[PDB]
Design a protein around this ligand. Structure first.
Ligand SMILES: Nc1ncnc2c1ncn2[C@@H]1O[C@H](CSCC[C@H](N)C(=O)O)[C@@H](O)[C@H]1O
Ligand SMILES: CNc1cc(C)c(C(N)=O)c[n+]1C
Length: 247
């Protein structure tokens, strides 16, 4: 299984964004995140776990959370995030994704307004390791109202016991009754970024549900989509989305 130090050196954030941000999946993820945050889940603080170099998973969340903390294992990934946050020239063009979210939300606001709301919400950009009892290391944070994690845990966990432990580790960042939002690939053993291969833990819906209950959460809803990534990218059998609450 891919060692975590491989994410520091061999995960190219720009290439990842070019390759995936595939469109049918992105549309579905955006609809689900809009449903969760704008049509319910809210608070003062949301922690996004394994953010990578993406901002798409935060576009509807910034309407419901005063503060958003973005986290990842890779320093290169956080640097790419910060380029967009600081509106740098070499920052990735999220404008077609931003326009799509504005349409879903009833066309209340336009693209630049949406982007400014996200940039204002993101207060901290932090290093994280989901395999650690303290994922944020020595960095102190108030208990979060919500912990979000998109397409991370399958890639970060080498086996089912580590996956369950990672869910418990994420729980330590959550207030009692706090929400856990996870969206990830089903039965995927790898994913590609050009010629670079990355391992993935191939989990079915039953193993995901069991791990979440074992980790001390109650599931509110669980959705499975049949849509898989292109043959050239991965071997997944769809994706899942779940909303759970910490016991
Ligand atoms: N142990 C670990 N702890 C935290 N993040 C990890 C990790 N191992 C890998 N990652 C991160 O998991 C990410 C997978 S890519 C997912 C990126 C983004 N959330 C999206 O939805 O597209 C990478 O950014 C990688 O750096
Ligand atoms: C689009 N990003 C993806 C896609 C897939 C299919 C997997 C996986 N777990 O195989 C991981 N990431 C990060």
């Amino acid at each position: 299984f891919t060692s975590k130090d491989t994410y520091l050196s061999h995960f190219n954030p720009r290439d990842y964004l070019e390759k995936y941000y595939e469109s049918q999946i992105l549309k579905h993820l955006l609809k689900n995140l809009f449903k969760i945050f704008c049509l319910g889940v809210k608070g003062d603080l949301l922690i996004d776990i394994g953010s990578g170099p993406t901002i798409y998973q935060l576009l509807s969340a910034c309407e419901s959370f005063k503060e958003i903390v973005v986290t990842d294992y890779s320093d290169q990934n956080l640097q790419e995030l910060e380029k967009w946050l600081k509106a740098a020239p070499a920052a990735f063009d999220w404008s077609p994704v931003v326009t799509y979210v504005c349409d879903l939300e009833g066309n209340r606001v336009k693209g630049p307004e949406k982007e400014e709301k996200l940039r204002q919400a993101v207060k901290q950009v932090l290093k994280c390791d989901v395999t650690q009892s303290q994922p944020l290391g020595a960095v102190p944070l108030p208990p979060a109202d919500c912990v979000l994690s998109t397409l991370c845990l399958d890639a970060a966990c080498p086996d089912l016991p580590t996956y369950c432990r990672a869910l418990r580790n994420l729980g330590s960042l959550l207030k009692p009754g706090g929400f856990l939002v996870i969206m990830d690939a089903l039965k995927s053993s790898y994913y590609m970024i050009g010629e670079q291969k990355f391992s993935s833990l191939p989990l079915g819906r039953e193993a995901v549900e069991a791990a979440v209950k074992e980790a001390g959460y109650t599931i509110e809803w669980f959705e499975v989509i049949s849509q898989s990534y292109s043959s050239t990218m991965a071997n997944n059998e769809g994706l899942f989305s779940l909303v759970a609450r910490k016991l």
